[PDB]
Amino acid sequence: PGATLCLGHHAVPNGTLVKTITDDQIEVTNATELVQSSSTGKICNNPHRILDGIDCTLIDALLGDPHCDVFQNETWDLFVERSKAFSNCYPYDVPDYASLRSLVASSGTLEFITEGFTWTGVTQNGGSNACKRGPGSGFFSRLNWLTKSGSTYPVLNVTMPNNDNFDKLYIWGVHHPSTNQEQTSLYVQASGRVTVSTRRSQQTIIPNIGSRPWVRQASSRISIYWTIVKPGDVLVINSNGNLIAPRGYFKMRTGKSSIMRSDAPIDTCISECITPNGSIPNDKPFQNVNKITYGACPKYVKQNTLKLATGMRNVPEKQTR
Amino acid sequence: GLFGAIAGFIENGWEGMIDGWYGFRHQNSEGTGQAADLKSTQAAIDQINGKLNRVIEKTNEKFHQIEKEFSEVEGRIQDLEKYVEDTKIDLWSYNAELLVALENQHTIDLTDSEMNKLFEKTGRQLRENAEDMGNGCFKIYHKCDNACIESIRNGTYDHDVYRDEALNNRFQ
Ligand SMILES: *[C@@H]1O[C@H](CO)[C@@H](O[C@@H]2O[C@H](CO)[C@@H](O[C@@H]3O[C@H](CO)[C@@H](O)[C@H](O)[C@@H]3O)[C@H](O)[C@H]2NC(C)=O)[C@H](O)[C@H]1NC(C)=O
Ligand SMILES: *[C@@H]1O[C@H](CO)[C@@H](O[C@@H]2O[C@H](CO)[C@@H](O[C@@H]3O[C@H](CO)[C@@H](O)[C@H](O)[C@@H]3O)[C@H](O)[C@H]2NC(C)=O)[C@H](O)[C@H]1NC(C)=O
Ligand SMILES: *[C@@H]1O[C@H](CO)[C@@H](O[C@@H]2O[C@H](CO)[C@@H](O)[C@H](O)[C@H]2NC(C)=O)[C@H](O)[C@H]1NC(C)=O
Ligand SMILES: *[C@@H]1O[C@H](CO)[C@@H](O)[C@H](O)[C@H]1NC(C)=O
């Protein structure tokens, strides 16, 4: 009459199915989720500086549309553009809009430095009822609409050297009148021209006269351009009509700044990872919330769940029912 | 699994064992009982914590990237932007799928392995005083009181003490 000693292992009543090399589903005692599939629906206000655009796109804040004046000199880690944003100034386009938005978003600042341009023989500070400032006509705060003085618009030829140790971003434009009457009334010459250059590059834009769709009282347009001037280089602006002049430059930076389109509300909490759906935790290595992210984020995958086994094979007793 | 213990020569697991992952059940003249083996349990848990911590190791932080949704039809540049992102996502989705498959196969095999290590260790401890029944149970051919069982489980069982007794019961 001896003894028995049996070796064994545990099991649990409610195991979990996982995938392996040989099995698409096999039961283990426990597992843990590797895909973050939920958000709170809110963008946490820390630790990144979030700037809510509210009614303004980044470009409208840049140009200085009056209802975006509150964004003057603002900074951000993440600029958030809302679907409710609208423009309310002179109608405009930006050839390569996406690039200008990108480079400004990435610079992370709208810090503007006014420079003393001398515009000899023209009238400055033109305004329009399309772009009201208080009760009266106005214009983009960062741009200077030049027109004839008396009965002449001379050749404008000005320079601004960059003697700082940082890059300057100049935003300028060209006016496209809708009629010949408008062209000659404003600029005298029947056809204008704008040439903006540095030592190594140049942009020449010829205005086109013609109607575009009526927007906020104008069939005319302004087209927006930009020029970066590096330390030791120089800006020259040359025009015999249609120049929408810069008032100065934006200071460029490099760093971690970006921009995101989202309607998620901003809330008081801390989250490294931001998506357009809201912040998400970053404890898991993968996520299926949104391919668009900012910060220390799990990597986007197509799977909505992936289970990492955290226990042995779950083998319950052979069932008698 | 590769070692043939869990879901193998051991018929099933024990729902009753709630204080460890592997362990011992016995019958002797004083009755029957159960005890968890801490060392095997901890070896499995440590390996699983190790792989879990490697997998969740935060390694990526990105700031300004490319746009991934578009309000206008543009053609060539947008086709490329979308294809770059779609390509990336498929490659990462594959990495994730493969990772869990390999990890999980290995977790099953390592847990099976630890069961087997405990069984082989126990067998070695018992030398000639026991026989492998083939279902994870040793028939012990001598009087093994509770002090004797605990001696096997805590690594102090001297097989010489019981050898003559056991050898005799075996070759009769
Ligand atoms: C088996 O693994 C599961 C994971 O699939 C474990 O569930 C997780 O357990 C942890 C620790 O108890 C929970 O963390 C805690 O969450 C609460 C919020 O409810 C928080 O207040 C605590 O500070 C802590 O972070 C976690 O929520 C839970 N997750 C899920 C999805 O259930 C479970 O503990 C494991 N069980 C065994 C026996 O190993
Ligand atoms: C339009 O305005 C620009 C900007 O001021 C004028 O450019 C300047 O033109 C003068 C020559 O007319 C350049 O002077 C030269 O400088 C070199 C280097 O110092 C010197 O060695 C020469 O003897 C000569 O004096 C000056 O450098 C140049 N400056 C810039 C920034 O371009 C341009 O002449 C004006 N054009 C008209 C038609 O008025
Ligand atoms: C996060 O937001 C995305 C994008 O808005 C959601 O996906 C969209 O909504 C449904 C998904 O069932 C679809 O009709 C659209 O095609 C999706 N759009 C895109 C661009 O993929 C997504 O479901 C949200 N996820 C969470 C967890 O809130
Ligand atoms: C913006 O910043 C510059 C200097 O950094 C300053 O000269 C200017 O007055 C500021 N304007 C506003 C509106 O803050």
Coordinates of C-alpha atoms and ligand atoms in Angstrom, one line a residue:
Chain A
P1 CA 0.0 0.0 0.0
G2 CA 1.9 3.0 -1.4
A3 CA 1.2 6.5 -2.7
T4 CA 0.3 8.5 -5.9
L5 CA 1.8 11.9 -6.8
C6 CA 0.3 13.6 -9.8
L7 CA 1.8 16.6 -11.6
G8 CA -0.6 19.1 -13.2
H9 CA -1.4 22.7 -14.2
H10 CA -4.3 25.1 -13.6
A11 CA -7.2 25.8 -15.8
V12 CA -9.9 28.5 -15.6
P13 CA -13.7 28.5 -16.2
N14 CA -13.7 31.4 -18.8
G15 CA -10.6 31.3 -21.1
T16 CA -9.9 33.5 -24.1
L17 CA -9.4 32.7 -27.8
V18 CA -6.0 33.7 -29.4
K19 CA -4.3 33.1 -32.7
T20 CA -1.0 31.2 -33.2
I21 CA 1.1 29.8 -36.1
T22 CA -1.0 26.6 -36.3
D23 CA -4.4 27.8 -35.1
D24 CA -6.6 30.7 -36.0
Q25 CA -8.4 30.3 -32.7
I26 CA -7.2 28.4 -29.6
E27 CA -8.1 28.8 -26.0
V28 CA -5.6 30.1 -23.3
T29 CA -6.2 31.0 -19.7
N30 CA -5.8 34.8 -20.3
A31 CA -4.8 37.4 -22.9
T32 CA -4.2 41.1 -23.3
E33 CA -5.4 43.5 -26.0
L34 CA -2.7 45.1 -28.2
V35 CA -5.0 47.3 -30.3
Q36 CA -6.4 50.6 -28.9
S37 CA -9.8 50.9 -30.5
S38 CA -11.4 53.6 -28.4
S39 CA -11.1 57.3 -27.6
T40 CA -12.7 59.6 -25.0
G41 CA -13.8 61.8 -27.9
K42 CA -11.9 64.8 -26.5
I43 CA -8.5 66.3 -27.2
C44 CA -6.5 66.6 -24.0
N45 CA -5.1 70.1 -23.4
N46 CA -1.8 68.8 -22.1
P47 CA 1.0 68.1 -22.5
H48 CA 0.9 69.7 -26.0
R49 CA 0.0 73.3 -26.6
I50 CA -3.3 73.0 -28.5
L51 CA -4.5 76.1 -30.4
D52 CA -8.2 75.9 -31.3
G53 CA -8.8 77.7 -34.7
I54 CA -12.5 78.1 -33.8
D55 CA -13.9 80.0 -36.9
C56 CA -10.4 80.3 -38.6
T57 CA -8.2 78.3 -40.8
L58 CA -4.5 78.7 -40.2
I59 CA -4.2 80.5 -43.5
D60 CA -6.9 83.1 -42.5
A61 CA -5.1 83.6 -39.2
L62 CA -1.8 84.0 -41.1
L63 CA -3.2 86.6 -43.6
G64 CA -5.1 88.5 -40.9
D65 CA -8.8 88.1 -41.8
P66 CA -10.4 90.5 -39.2
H67 CA -12.4 87.8 -37.4
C68 CA -9.0 85.9 -37.0
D69 CA -7.2 88.9 -35.5
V70 CA -7.2 87.2 -32.1
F71 CA -4.6 84.7 -33.6
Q72 CA -2.0 87.4 -34.2
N73 CA 1.4 86.2 -33.0
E74 CA 0.0 82.9 -31.7
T75 CA 2.0 79.7 -31.2
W76 CA 1.1 76.0 -31.1
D77 CA 2.3 72.5 -30.9
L78 CA -1.0 71.5 -32.7
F79 CA -3.2 73.9 -34.5
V80 CA -6.8 72.4 -34.8
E81 CA -8.9 73.5 -37.7
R82 CA -12.7 73.1 -37.3
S83 CA -15.2 72.2 -40.0
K84 CA -17.2 75.4 -39.0
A85 CA -14.3 77.7 -40.1
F86 CA -15.1 80.4 -42.6
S87 CA -13.3 83.2 -44.5
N88 CA -14.8 86.8 -44.2
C89 CA -12.3 89.1 -46.0
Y90 CA -11.3 89.8 -49.7
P91 CA -11.8 86.6 -51.8
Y92 CA -8.5 84.9 -52.4
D93 CA -6.7 81.8 -53.6
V94 CA -3.3 80.3 -52.7
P95 CA -1.6 78.4 -55.5
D96 CA 0.0 75.6 -53.5
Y97 CA -2.3 76.3 -50.5
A98 CA -1.4 72.9 -49.0
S99 CA 2.3 73.7 -49.0
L100 CA 1.9 77.1 -47.4
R101 CA -0.4 75.6 -44.7
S102 CA 2.1 72.8 -44.1
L103 CA 5.2 75.0 -43.8
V104 CA 3.4 77.5 -41.4
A105 CA 1.8 74.6 -39.4
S106 CA 5.3 73.1 -39.0
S107 CA 6.9 76.4 -38.0
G108 CA 4.5 76.6 -35.1
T109 CA 4.2 80.4 -34.9
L110 CA 2.5 83.5 -36.4
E111 CA 5.0 85.9 -34.9
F112 CA 5.1 88.8 -37.2
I113 CA 7.7 91.6 -37.4
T114 CA 6.7 94.8 -39.2
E115 CA 9.3 96.3 -41.6
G116 CA 9.6 99.9 -42.9
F117 CA 8.9 99.3 -46.6
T118 CA 9.0 102.6 -48.6
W119 CA 6.3 102.6 -51.3
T120 CA 7.1 105.8 -53.2
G121 CA 4.3 107.4 -55.3
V122 CA 1.4 105.1 -54.4
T123 CA -1.5 105.1 -51.9
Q124 CA -1.2 102.6 -49.1
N125 CA -3.7 100.7 -46.9
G126 CA -6.4 100.0 -49.4
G127 CA -9.6 98.5 -48.1
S128 CA -12.8 96.9 -49.2
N129 CA -16.3 96.3 -47.9
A130 CA -15.6 92.6 -48.6
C131 CA -13.3 92.8 -45.5
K132 CA -14.9 94.9 -42.8
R133 CA -12.9 96.1 -39.7
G134 CA -15.5 97.5 -37.3
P135 CA -18.1 99.5 -39.3
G136 CA -15.9 100.5 -42.3
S137 CA -13.9 98.9 -45.1
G138 CA -10.7 97.0 -44.3
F139 CA -8.2 94.4 -45.4
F140 CA -6.0 91.5 -44.3
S141 CA -3.9 92.9 -41.4
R142 CA -0.6 91.6 -42.7
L143 CA -1.0 92.8 -46.3
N144 CA -0.8 96.4 -47.7
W145 CA -3.1 97.1 -50.7
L146 CA -1.2 99.6 -52.9
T147 CA -3.0 101.8 -55.4
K148 CA -2.4 104.9 -57.5
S149 CA -1.5 108.3 -56.0
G150 CA -3.1 111.1 -58.0
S151 CA -3.1 109.9 -61.6
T152 CA 0.1 107.7 -61.5
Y153 CA 1.4 104.4 -60.3
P154 CA 5.1 104.4 -60.8
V155 CA 7.4 101.4 -61.0
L156 CA 7.8 100.2 -57.4
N157 CA 11.3 98.9 -56.7
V158 CA 12.2 98.1 -53.1
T159 CA 14.6 96.0 -51.1
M160 CA 14.8 94.4 -47.6
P161 CA 18.0 92.6 -46.6
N162 CA 18.0 89.9 -44.0
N163 CA 20.7 90.8 -41.6
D164 CA 19.3 88.6 -38.8
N165 CA 20.4 85.0 -38.1
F166 CA 16.9 83.5 -38.7
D167 CA 14.8 82.8 -41.9
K168 CA 12.1 85.4 -42.8
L169 CA 8.8 84.3 -44.3
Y170 CA 7.2 87.0 -46.5
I171 CA 3.6 86.7 -47.5
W172 CA 2.5 88.8 -50.5
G173 CA -0.1 88.8 -53.3
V174 CA -1.3 89.9 -56.6
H175 CA -4.7 91.5 -57.3
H176 CA -6.8 90.1 -60.3
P177 CA -9.4 92.8 -61.1
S178 CA -12.6 91.6 -62.7
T179 CA -12.7 94.4 -65.4
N180 CA -10.3 96.7 -67.3
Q181 CA -12.0 99.7 -65.7
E182 CA -11.1 98.4 -62.3
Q183 CA -7.5 97.7 -63.4
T184 CA -6.9 101.2 -64.8
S185 CA -8.8 103.0 -62.0
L186 CA -6.6 101.3 -59.3
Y187 CA -3.2 100.9 -61.0
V188 CA -3.3 103.2 -64.2
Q189 CA -1.3 100.7 -66.3
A190 CA -3.6 98.4 -68.4
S191 CA -1.6 95.3 -67.3
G192 CA 0.3 95.0 -64.1
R193 CA 3.2 92.7 -63.0
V194 CA 4.7 91.6 -59.7
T195 CA 8.3 90.2 -59.5
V196 CA 9.6 89.1 -56.1
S197 CA 13.1 87.8 -55.9
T198 CA 16.1 86.9 -53.8
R199 CA 19.7 86.2 -54.9
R200 CA 18.9 82.6 -55.9
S201 CA 15.2 82.6 -56.8
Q202 CA 12.4 84.7 -58.4
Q203 CA 8.7 84.6 -58.9
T204 CA 7.0 86.7 -61.6
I205 CA 3.2 86.9 -61.6
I206 CA 1.1 88.6 -64.3
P207 CA -2.5 89.5 -63.3
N208 CA -5.4 88.2 -65.3
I209 CA -8.4 90.5 -65.7
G210 CA -11.8 88.7 -65.7
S211 CA -14.8 87.8 -63.5
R212 CA -14.6 84.9 -61.0
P213 CA -17.6 83.9 -59.0
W214 CA -19.0 86.7 -56.8
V215 CA -17.9 86.1 -53.2
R216 CA -18.5 88.6 -50.4
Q217 CA -19.2 91.4 -52.9
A218 CA -16.2 90.9 -55.3
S219 CA -15.8 89.2 -58.6
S220 CA -12.1 90.0 -58.3
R221 CA -9.5 87.9 -56.5
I222 CA -6.2 88.1 -54.7
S223 CA -3.7 85.3 -55.3
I224 CA -1.3 84.7 -52.4
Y225 CA 2.4 83.9 -52.7
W226 CA 5.3 83.4 -50.3
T227 CA 9.1 83.9 -50.3
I228 CA 11.6 82.7 -47.7
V229 CA 14.7 84.9 -47.2
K230 CA 17.7 83.3 -45.5
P231 CA 20.3 85.1 -43.4
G232 CA 22.6 87.1 -45.7
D233 CA 20.1 87.1 -48.6
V234 CA 17.9 90.0 -49.7
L235 CA 14.3 90.5 -50.8
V236 CA 13.5 92.7 -53.9
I237 CA 10.0 93.5 -54.9
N238 CA 9.4 95.1 -58.3
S239 CA 5.9 96.0 -59.7
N240 CA 4.2 98.4 -62.0
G241 CA 0.7 97.5 -60.7
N242 CA -1.4 94.9 -58.8
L243 CA 1.0 94.3 -55.9
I244 CA -0.5 93.3 -52.6
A245 CA 2.5 94.2 -50.5
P246 CA 3.9 92.5 -47.4
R247 CA 4.0 94.6 -44.2
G248 CA 6.9 92.6 -42.8
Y249 CA 7.8 89.0 -42.2
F250 CA 6.9 86.0 -40.1
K251 CA 9.6 84.4 -38.0
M252 CA 10.2 80.8 -39.0
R253 CA 11.1 78.1 -36.5
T254 CA 11.6 74.3 -36.7
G255 CA 10.3 71.9 -34.2
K256 CA 7.4 69.5 -33.4
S257 CA 4.5 71.7 -34.5
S258 CA 1.7 70.5 -36.8
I259 CA -1.9 70.9 -37.8
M260 CA -5.0 68.6 -37.6
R261 CA -8.6 68.8 -38.8
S262 CA -11.0 67.8 -36.0
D263 CA -14.2 68.8 -34.4
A264 CA -13.4 67.1 -31.1
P265 CA -13.7 69.4 -28.1
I266 CA -10.6 70.3 -26.0
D267 CA -10.8 69.1 -22.4
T268 CA -8.6 69.2 -19.3
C269 CA -6.6 66.0 -19.1
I270 CA -3.1 64.7 -20.1
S271 CA -2.5 62.6 -23.2
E272 CA 0.6 62.2 -25.4
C273 CA -1.4 60.9 -28.4
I274 CA -3.9 62.9 -30.3
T275 CA -6.2 61.8 -33.1
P276 CA -9.0 63.7 -34.9
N277 CA -11.5 61.5 -32.8
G278 CA -9.8 62.7 -29.6
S279 CA -6.9 61.7 -27.5
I280 CA -6.1 58.0 -27.1
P281 CA -4.0 56.1 -24.5
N282 CA -0.6 55.0 -25.7
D283 CA 0.0 51.9 -23.5
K284 CA -0.8 49.5 -26.4
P285 CA 1.6 49.1 -29.4
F286 CA -1.2 49.3 -32.1
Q287 CA -4.4 51.3 -32.6
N288 CA -7.3 51.3 -35.0
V289 CA -8.8 54.6 -34.1
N290 CA -7.4 56.8 -36.9
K291 CA -4.4 56.8 -39.3
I292 CA -4.1 60.5 -38.6
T293 CA -2.2 61.0 -35.3
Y294 CA 0.1 63.5 -33.5
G295 CA 2.5 62.6 -30.6
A296 CA 3.7 59.4 -29.0
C297 CA 1.1 57.1 -30.5
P298 CA 0.5 53.4 -31.1
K299 CA 1.0 52.4 -34.7
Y300 CA -2.2 52.3 -36.9
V301 CA -3.3 48.9 -38.0
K302 CA -6.4 47.6 -39.8
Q303 CA -7.2 45.0 -37.1
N304 CA -9.7 46.1 -34.5
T305 CA -8.4 43.5 -32.0
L306 CA -5.3 41.4 -31.5
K307 CA -4.9 39.3 -28.4
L308 CA -1.5 38.5 -26.9
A309 CA -1.7 35.3 -24.8
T310 CA -0.6 35.9 -21.2
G311 CA -1.1 32.3 -20.0
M312 CA -1.1 28.6 -20.9
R313 CA -3.4 26.6 -22.9
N314 CA -6.8 26.3 -21.1
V315 CA -7.8 22.6 -20.8
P316 CA -11.0 22.1 -18.8
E317 CA -12.0 18.7 -17.5
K318 CA -13.6 16.5 -20.2
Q319 CA -17.3 17.6 -20.0
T320 CA -19.9 15.1 -18.9
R321 CA -22.7 17.2 -20.4
Chain B
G1 CA 2.5 22.0 -27.7
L2 CA 6.0 20.8 -28.6
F3 CA 6.6 18.9 -25.3
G4 CA 3.3 17.0 -25.2
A5 CA 2.4 17.6 -21.6
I6 CA -0.3 20.3 -21.6
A7 CA -3.2 19.0 -23.7
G8 CA -1.0 15.9 -24.1
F9 CA -0.1 13.2 -21.5
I10 CA -1.7 15.4 -18.8
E11 CA -5.4 14.9 -19.6
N12 CA -6.6 18.3 -18.4
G13 CA -6.0 21.3 -16.1
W14 CA -7.2 21.8 -12.5
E15 CA -9.8 24.6 -12.0
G16 CA -9.3 24.0 -8.2
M17 CA -5.7 25.1 -8.3
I18 CA -6.1 28.9 -7.7
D19 CA -2.7 29.6 -5.9
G20 CA -0.3 28.6 -8.7
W21 CA 0.0 27.7 -12.4
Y22 CA 1.6 24.2 -11.9
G23 CA 1.6 21.9 -8.9
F24 CA 1.0 18.6 -7.1
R25 CA -1.9 16.4 -6.2
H26 CA -1.3 13.3 -4.0
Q27 CA -3.0 10.3 -2.4
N28 CA -1.4 8.5 0.5
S29 CA -2.6 6.8 3.7
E30 CA -3.4 10.1 5.4
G31 CA -5.7 11.2 2.5
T32 CA -5.5 13.5 -0.5
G33 CA -4.2 17.1 -1.1
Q34 CA -3.1 19.8 -3.5
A35 CA -0.1 22.2 -3.5
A36 CA 1.1 24.8 -6.0
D37 CA 4.8 24.7 -7.2
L38 CA 6.0 28.3 -6.9
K39 CA 9.2 27.9 -8.9
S40 CA 7.7 26.6 -12.1
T41 CA 4.7 29.0 -11.8
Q42 CA 7.1 32.0 -11.4
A43 CA 9.4 30.8 -14.3
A44 CA 6.3 30.9 -16.7
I45 CA 5.0 34.2 -15.3
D46 CA 8.4 35.9 -15.5
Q47 CA 8.9 34.8 -19.2
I48 CA 5.4 36.0 -20.1
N49 CA 5.9 39.4 -18.3
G50 CA 9.2 39.7 -20.1
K51 CA 7.6 39.3 -23.5
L52 CA 4.7 41.5 -22.6
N53 CA 7.1 44.3 -21.5
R54 CA 9.1 44.0 -24.7
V55 CA 6.0 44.2 -26.9
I56 CA 4.5 47.3 -25.2
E57 CA 7.8 49.1 -25.2
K58 CA 6.8 52.6 -26.5
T59 CA 9.0 53.3 -29.5
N60 CA 7.3 55.8 -31.8
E61 CA 6.5 59.5 -31.6
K62 CA 5.6 61.5 -34.7
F63 CA 4.7 65.1 -35.2
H64 CA 4.2 66.8 -38.6
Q65 CA 3.6 64.2 -41.3
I66 CA 1.7 64.0 -44.5
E67 CA -2.0 64.7 -45.0
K68 CA -4.1 61.5 -45.2
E69 CA -7.6 62.7 -46.0
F70 CA -8.4 65.1 -48.9
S71 CA -11.4 67.3 -49.7
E72 CA -10.5 67.7 -53.5
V73 CA -9.6 65.4 -56.3
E74 CA -6.0 66.1 -57.4
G75 CA -4.6 63.1 -59.2
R76 CA -0.9 62.2 -59.2
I77 CA 0.4 63.7 -56.0
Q78 CA -2.6 62.6 -54.0
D79 CA -2.5 59.1 -55.5
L80 CA 1.1 58.9 -54.2
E81 CA 0.3 60.2 -50.7
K82 CA -2.6 57.7 -50.3
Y83 CA -0.5 54.8 -51.7
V84 CA 2.4 55.6 -49.3
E85 CA 0.0 55.5 -46.3
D86 CA -1.9 52.5 -47.5
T87 CA 1.4 50.6 -48.0
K88 CA 2.7 51.6 -44.5
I89 CA -0.6 50.5 -42.9
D90 CA -0.6 47.1 -44.6
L91 CA 3.0 46.5 -43.6
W92 CA 2.3 47.4 -40.0
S93 CA -0.9 45.3 -40.0
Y94 CA 1.2 42.4 -41.2
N95 CA 3.8 43.0 -38.5
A96 CA 1.1 43.0 -35.8
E97 CA -0.5 39.8 -37.1
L98 CA 2.8 37.9 -37.4
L99 CA 4.0 39.2 -34.0
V100 CA 1.0 37.9 -32.1
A101 CA 1.0 34.5 -33.9
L102 CA 4.7 33.9 -33.1
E103 CA 4.4 35.2 -29.5
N104 CA 1.3 33.0 -28.9
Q105 CA 2.8 29.8 -30.4
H106 CA 5.8 30.4 -28.2
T107 CA 3.8 31.2 -25.1
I108 CA 1.9 27.9 -25.5
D109 CA 5.2 26.0 -26.1
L110 CA 7.0 27.6 -23.1
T111 CA 4.2 26.9 -20.7
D112 CA 4.1 23.3 -22.0
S113 CA 7.9 23.2 -21.5
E114 CA 7.6 24.3 -17.8
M115 CA 5.1 21.6 -17.1
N116 CA 7.5 19.1 -18.6
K117 CA 10.5 20.4 -16.7
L118 CA 8.6 20.0 -13.4
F119 CA 7.6 16.5 -14.3
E120 CA 11.1 15.4 -15.3
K121 CA 12.6 17.0 -12.2
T122 CA 10.2 15.2 -10.0
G123 CA 10.9 11.9 -11.7
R124 CA 14.6 12.4 -11.2
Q125 CA 14.1 13.2 -7.5
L126 CA 12.3 9.9 -7.0
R127 CA 15.1 7.8 -8.6
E128 CA 14.1 4.1 -8.3
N129 CA 11.4 4.5 -5.6
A130 CA 8.6 5.4 -8.2
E131 CA 7.2 4.7 -11.7
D132 CA 5.7 6.9 -14.4
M133 CA 2.1 5.9 -14.9
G134 CA 2.0 7.9 -18.2
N135 CA -0.7 10.4 -17.3
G136 CA 1.6 12.8 -15.3
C137 CA 1.2 10.6 -12.1
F138 CA 4.0 8.7 -10.3
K139 CA 3.1 5.6 -8.4
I140 CA 5.4 5.8 -5.3
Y141 CA 6.2 2.3 -4.0
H142 CA 6.5 3.1 -0.3
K143 CA 4.8 4.7 2.7
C144 CA 4.9 8.4 2.0
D145 CA 3.3 10.3 4.8
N146 CA 2.5 14.1 4.5
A147 CA 6.1 15.0 5.7
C148 CA 7.4 12.7 2.9
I149 CA 5.1 14.4 0.2
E150 CA 6.1 17.9 1.3
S151 CA 9.8 16.7 1.2
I152 CA 9.3 15.8 -2.5
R153 CA 7.6 19.2 -3.2
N154 CA 10.2 21.3 -1.3
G155 CA 13.2 19.5 -2.7
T156 CA 14.4 17.6 0.4
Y157 CA 13.3 14.0 -0.4
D158 CA 16.2 11.6 0.2
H159 CA 15.6 8.6 -2.1
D160 CA 18.2 6.4 -0.2
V161 CA 16.0 6.4 3.0
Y162 CA 13.1 4.6 1.2
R163 CA 15.0 2.7 -1.5
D164 CA 15.1 -0.8 0.0
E165 CA 11.4 -0.6 0.9
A166 CA 10.5 0.7 -2.6
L167 CA 12.7 -1.7 -4.6
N168 CA 11.2 -4.6 -2.8
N169 CA 7.6 -3.6 -3.5
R170 CA 8.5 -3.0 -7.2
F171 CA 10.2 -6.3 -8.0
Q172 CA 7.6 -8.7 -6.5
Ligands
LIG1 C1 -5.8 38.7 -17.1 O1 -5.5 39.8 -18.0 C2 -6.4 40.8 -18.1 C3 -6.2 41.7 -19.3 O2 -6.8 41.2 -20.4 C4 -6.3 41.6 -16.8 O3 -7.4 42.6 -16.7 C5 -6.8 43.9 -16.3 O4 -6.4 43.9 -15.0 C6 -5.7 45.1 -14.6 C7 -5.2 44.9 -13.1 O5 -6.3 44.5 -12.3 C8 -6.6 46.3 -14.7 O6 -5.9 47.4 -14.5 C9 -6.5 48.3 -13.6 O7 -7.6 49.0 -14.2 C10 -8.4 49.8 -13.3 C11 -9.6 50.4 -14.1 O8 -10.7 49.5 -14.1 C12 -7.5 50.9 -12.7 O9 -8.2 51.7 -11.7 C13 -6.3 50.3 -12.1 O10 -5.4 51.3 -11.6 C14 -5.6 49.3 -13.0 O11 -5.0 50.1 -14.1 C15 -7.3 46.3 -16.1 O12 -8.3 47.3 -16.1 C16 -7.8 45.0 -16.6 N1 -8.2 45.1 -18.0 C17 -9.2 44.5 -18.5 C18 -9.4 44.8 -20.0 O13 -9.9 43.7 -17.9 C19 -6.5 40.7 -15.5 O14 -6.1 41.4 -14.4 C20 -5.7 39.4 -15.7 N2 -6.0 38.4 -14.7 C21 -5.2 37.5 -14.2 C22 -5.7 36.6 -13.2 O15 -4.0 37.5 -14.6
LIG2 C1 16.0 98.7 -57.8 O1 16.4 98.5 -56.4 C2 17.5 97.7 -56.2 C3 17.7 97.5 -54.7 O2 18.3 98.7 -54.1 C4 18.7 98.3 -56.8 O3 19.8 97.3 -56.7 C5 21.1 98.0 -56.4 O4 21.6 98.5 -57.5 C6 23.0 99.0 -57.4 C7 23.4 99.4 -58.8 O5 22.4 100.2 -59.5 C8 23.9 98.0 -56.8 O6 25.1 98.7 -56.5 C9 26.3 97.9 -56.8 O7 26.8 97.3 -55.6 C10 28.0 96.6 -55.7 C11 28.3 95.7 -54.5 O8 28.2 96.5 -53.3 C12 29.1 97.6 -56.0 O9 30.4 97.0 -56.0 C13 28.8 98.3 -57.4 O10 29.8 99.3 -57.7 C14 27.4 98.9 -57.3 O11 27.4 100.1 -56.6 C15 23.4 97.5 -55.5 O12 24.2 96.4 -55.0 C16 22.0 96.9 -55.8 N1 21.5 96.3 -54.5 C17 20.7 95.3 -54.4 C18 20.3 94.9 -53.0 O13 20.2 94.7 -55.4 C19 18.4 98.5 -58.3 O14 19.5 99.1 -59.0 C20 17.1 99.3 -58.5 N2 16.9 99.4 -59.9 C21 16.4 100.5 -60.5 C22 16.2 100.4 -62.0 O15 16.2 101.6 -59.9
LIG3 C1 -12.6 57.9 -35.8 O1 -12.9 58.8 -36.9 C2 -12.9 58.1 -38.1 C3 -12.9 59.1 -39.2 O2 -13.9 60.1 -39.0 C4 -14.0 57.0 -38.2 O3 -14.2 56.3 -39.4 C5 -15.2 56.9 -40.3 O4 -16.6 56.6 -40.0 C6 -17.1 55.4 -40.5 C7 -16.5 54.2 -39.7 O5 -17.4 53.2 -39.5 C8 -17.1 55.3 -42.0 O6 -18.3 55.6 -42.6 C9 -16.0 56.3 -42.6 O7 -15.6 55.7 -43.9 C10 -14.8 56.4 -41.7 N1 -13.9 57.4 -42.3 C11 -12.6 57.1 -42.5 C12 -11.8 58.3 -43.1 O8 -12.0 56.0 -42.3 C13 -13.7 56.0 -37.0 O9 -14.7 55.0 -36.9 C14 -13.6 56.7 -35.7 N2 -13.2 55.7 -34.7 C15 -13.6 55.8 -33.4 C16 -13.1 54.7 -32.5 O10 -14.2 56.8 -33.0
LIG4 C1 4.2 90.4 -32.3 O1 5.6 90.2 -31.9 C2 6.6 91.2 -32.3 C3 8.0 90.9 -31.8 O2 8.1 89.5 -31.5 C4 6.1 92.6 -31.8 O3 7.0 93.6 -32.3 C5 4.7 92.9 -32.2 O4 4.3 94.1 -31.7 C6 3.8 91.7 -31.7 N1 2.4 92.0 -32.0 C7 1.3 91.5 -31.4 C8 0.0 91.9 -31.9 O5 1.4 90.8 -30.4

